[PDB]
């Protein structure tokens, strides 16, 4: 039984411009087993309309997923991705840094 911690990336589909439609992406990869819980957060709450890709894995048998939602980036708005997994003592939050 091999358990691998997730790797979390929070990024936008396009470079962010305040006031134009975009997509907020949370890329969770390199984790085993498959059972994972991923949430997209806006100003402390949980975004209800979030879609995710179909489960797949890399050459090293590690799964990856893409959780995404449609959003209009604005200043004063804070976005983050929360990922819970069997290998984490507590859920991990990665915030949306613009130039990241």
């Amino acid at each position, epitope marked *: 039984m091999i358990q691998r911690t997730p790797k979390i990336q929070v990024y936008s589909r396009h470079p962010a411009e305040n006031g134009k439609s975009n997509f907020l992406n949370c890329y969770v990869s390199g984790f085993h087993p498959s059972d994972i*819980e991923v949430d997209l*957060l806006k*100003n*402390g*709450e*949980r975004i*209800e309309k979030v879609e995710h890709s179909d489960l797949s894995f890399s050459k090293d048998w590690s799964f990856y997923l893409l959780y995404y939602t449609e959003f209009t980036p604005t200043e004063k708005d*804070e*976005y*983050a991705c929360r990922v*819970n*997994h*069997v*290998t*984490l*003592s*507590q*859920p991990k*939050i990665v*915030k949306w840094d613009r130039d990241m």
Partner: nanobody
Framework: EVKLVESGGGLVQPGGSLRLSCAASGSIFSINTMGWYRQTPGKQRDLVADISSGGSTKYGDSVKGRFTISRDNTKNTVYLQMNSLKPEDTAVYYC??????????WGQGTQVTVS
């Protein structure tokens, strides 16, 4: 900065009821979502019930229907009503809160033992 205070744990027979309460310090506009995570033996805490400032609630798959979470919006205190308790509910329940900047704050945790 923000400290979470938990109360209401203890021992209870199956089929009983317990009410947990978690209160947050600071101003009212400091915490958005408050909820509870409970320990699983495999170094992981799973969701029990969380509520946002506007009342958007979510429950775990194992506590649907049985647990109810309510928020006293005048302050930053939330309550969890647990009904139809089972032996499988015996775990340490952690309160948590998310700030409007997505900073998670956790409490020490209270033991709920179901015999």
């Amino acid at each position: 900065e923000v400290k979470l205070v938990e109360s209401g744990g203890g021992l209870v027979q199956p089929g009983g009821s317990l009410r947990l309460s978690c209160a947050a310090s600071g101003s009212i506009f400091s915490i958005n979502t408050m909820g509870w995570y409970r320990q699983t033996p495999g170094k992981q805490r799973d969701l029990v019930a969380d509520i946002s400032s506007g009342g958007s609630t979510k429950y775990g798959d194992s506590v649907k229907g049985r647990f109810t979470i309510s928020r006293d919006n005048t302050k930053n205190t939330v309550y969890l009503q647990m009904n139809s308790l089972k032996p499988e509910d015996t775990a340490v329940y952690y309160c948590y809160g998310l700030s409007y900047s997505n900073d998670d704050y956790w409490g020490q945790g209270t033991q709920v033992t179901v015999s």
